[PDB]
Amino acid sequence: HHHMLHLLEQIRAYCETCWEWQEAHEPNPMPAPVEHQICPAVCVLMKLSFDEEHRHAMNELGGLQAIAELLQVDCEMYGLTNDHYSITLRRYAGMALTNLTFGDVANKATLCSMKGCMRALVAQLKSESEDLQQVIASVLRNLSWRADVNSKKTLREVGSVKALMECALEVKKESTLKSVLSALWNLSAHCTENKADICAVDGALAFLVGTLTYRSQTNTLAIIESGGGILRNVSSLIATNEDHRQILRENNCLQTLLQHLKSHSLTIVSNACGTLWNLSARNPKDQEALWDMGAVSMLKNLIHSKHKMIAMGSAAALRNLMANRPAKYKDAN
């Protein structure tokens, strides 16, 4: 913990020189992190941060604040027209911020209060380094989990929703998509504005429907779970917009949500019930489509679930269908 003390000192000193140089310009050469051996200092701290005891130690020294200050000043100074040394420093800083925000109420609140830093994080979602995108999305995921009211407000105001959703459309790797969709699933639960901002991004809804049938090479359900959780969270709005329901229908959303009802993942089943609850309301064509696919018996099979949202959503969707039995069914016509 002397070692940690020393590395944090190096970081704070470097930040202080950067802030002097910035403040020289208000009413010496520009500091370069390579000239202060910053990348190895944050690398070490990043490695230490995986251990719970080392994290407690870091927190007594304000490690989160100092590493956030570093990230923020480097982004301000060099933006996205930076070099590899700088991309590297931001990655290892971002990993550390992920580890330090995990489960940590104070650390989340502090970081979300740093508005400059929050803006810097969101800007990195467009980094040439997709791995850096993954790292930044991991931070945002943590910050969006159990966010207090000020932190929710900040996450929204810095444009994290639209940025993440745009990000998702361009990523090539599963790991990046997992972190991006997890952050978006958390964000989608905060407020209706966030739900609207997802639905507004051109191509998002189709993309999200696409994730419901993702073929993970790593024998996991993480992508289906997060993509379906976003969808279930935005379905209340989708239900109001015929254009949006149409996008869903013509990417085979409905037959997929019915197949989800049989999952071993309670998360997948719950997400599907919640989305069906909303999409089964009002629209006779979607009601009839669902009747024709045997939704009624499928939903009846879940109404006794121990899982409160599964039981609630299945029964609600079922009442929607049962109240609107299509004319062709009424023994005919």
């Binding site: 995986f50 990993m95 550390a96 992920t98 580890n99 925000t101 995990f102 489960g103 790292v135 991991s138 995921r141 943590n142 989990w145 159990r146 790991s175 972190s179 969709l181 997890s182 952050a183 699933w185 958390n186 779970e225 997060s226 959780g229």
Partner: peptide, 7 residues
Amino acid sequence: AGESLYE
């Protein structure tokens, strides 16, 4: 989705 350590 929940929170987590860097992966």
